[PDB]
Symmetry: C2
Subunit: 114 residues, 2 copies
């Protein structure tokens, strides 16, 4: 059994053509998990995960801040204490329009990798 | 399967009492349940002060994230308390349980493969 403070997992900085101002922690990855993986994302002020889709779902819980969720058309802001279920193949992305860091838990089935 | 995305305040789900031979002082909210989940389910558990999930095991894993409070985790050998911001991975068949030794509610997210129910 693994018990660990999430913050202590080293975050990975992401800065690409589609993702900027984002850090990813893999809390429960493919080494350990037989079916699905647990990640924790931190979105800096102004950070962006641009619209994309994939053949697997997301299950998300917003831990801190106000997260802007991009939809195929339009967007919706939600707060700490919201959960989000993104169906497979649905277009989605994320932005942080606030002045402080936003954090969310994100789980995907193993085929999504970590 | 269906398209779209659900975005919902977890507290809009009513916390339902869990009461079994091996659980007392616990409530649960099913957030992403069997009716919708392709692969795994998301629950939010509330452990009342003094609540207890006795040591047990089952043929599926748990993935847990502690949202609020100090959670005492029961292991096959001894126990360890963790707090908000900790995650826990419980392997299939590993003995585990939980206690809330504090005077306030403890909350944690708990995800299992959907073959284990909701
Ligand atoms: Zn995605
Ligand atoms: Zn269990």
């Amino acid at each position: 059994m693994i018990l660990k403070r999430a913050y202590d997992v080293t975050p990975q900085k992401i800065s690409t053509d589609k993702v900027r101002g984002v850090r990813k922690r893999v809390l429960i990855g493919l080494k350990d998990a037989p079916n699905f993986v647990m990640r924790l994302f931190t979105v800096e002020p102004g950070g962006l995960i641009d619209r994309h889709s994939h053949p697997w779902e997301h299950e998300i819980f917003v831990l801190k801040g106000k997260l802007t969720v991009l939809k195929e058309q339009g967007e919706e802001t939600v707060e700490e204490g919201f959960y989000i279920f993104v169906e497979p193949n649905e277009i989605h992305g994320f932005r942080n329009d606030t002045d402080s860091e936003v954090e969310f838990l994100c789980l995907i089935p193993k085929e999504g990798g970590e």
